[PDB]
Amino acid sequence: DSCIQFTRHASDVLLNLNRLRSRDILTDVVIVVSREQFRAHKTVLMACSGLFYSIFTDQLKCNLSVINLDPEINPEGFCILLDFMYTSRLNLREGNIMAVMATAMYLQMEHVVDTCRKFIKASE
Template sequence: MKVAELSGQLQTPRRCTNQSIQTQRESQVTDFPGHVDQVFQQLNYQRLRGQLCDCVIVVGNRHFKAHRAVLAACSTHFRALFSVAESNGGMNVIQLDSEVVTAEALSVLVDMMYTSTLMLEESNVMDVLLAASHLHLNSVVKACKHYMSTRTLHLSLPGKRYMHCSDQHAAGTASSSRLQHPFLQQYKVLPIKVKEEA
């Protein structure tokens, strides 16, 4: 009788339901909406103080310390440069042509990469546009084009580093090679009113 009772108990084991298994496996997912902003604030804090930076971008006589991961995440041009540098022994110093990327434009672009804020002015928009195109920052290129299309820009003719190329005669007489840059010539159809400074 005891054997029969025991065998009966063995034949009806306790079953774990799907619900109990799911309860045991459930995990809590917590979202921290401000986390990314805090991380980038700290990275920018480090950059401005030269802390934990692992690369230097050189433009003319200006040196910009930064984090390779941040620059490479924002710019495919920097990603390619750093990838080549790593394969050649990890060189952390990148020299940019100051005729294509000015120090002032790079400063604006690096600030944007860390803060997501782009500071455009009439005095810098052409340099920022050219630099952003060279560095493959497409969203910045669009922002520059939008800025230029919604304003009457007072850009100086020959004698300044940049100008609008819609005036082909002025472009032909310009002395600076930057004025003849093919990238700038793409934008001669933009609806921008250019006024000469008195």
């Protein structure tokens, strides 16, 4: 086509989706990770995670307002990945890298798994 493109559009959309999340506006699911609860937008979760894409395209699970993750999933690891989904920024640290990598593998977030593997290989 003969379209023009606004370079910052995708980043501005994501910034606004994060603002809606922070104000709990039109959030339609709560992700339960052991004792912790995280409110989010199903569409953002699906757009970022192979696991959520699978869950919310399921004819029964698409209608659930609460999703309980595997008890082995670390809440801090999930929190870091949820922030990444809404911002493109990953708070990767020596003290959380193993939890973040395990959570990204479970959530099926390949690019996060890739950078965790690379940061781990560099420290060995």
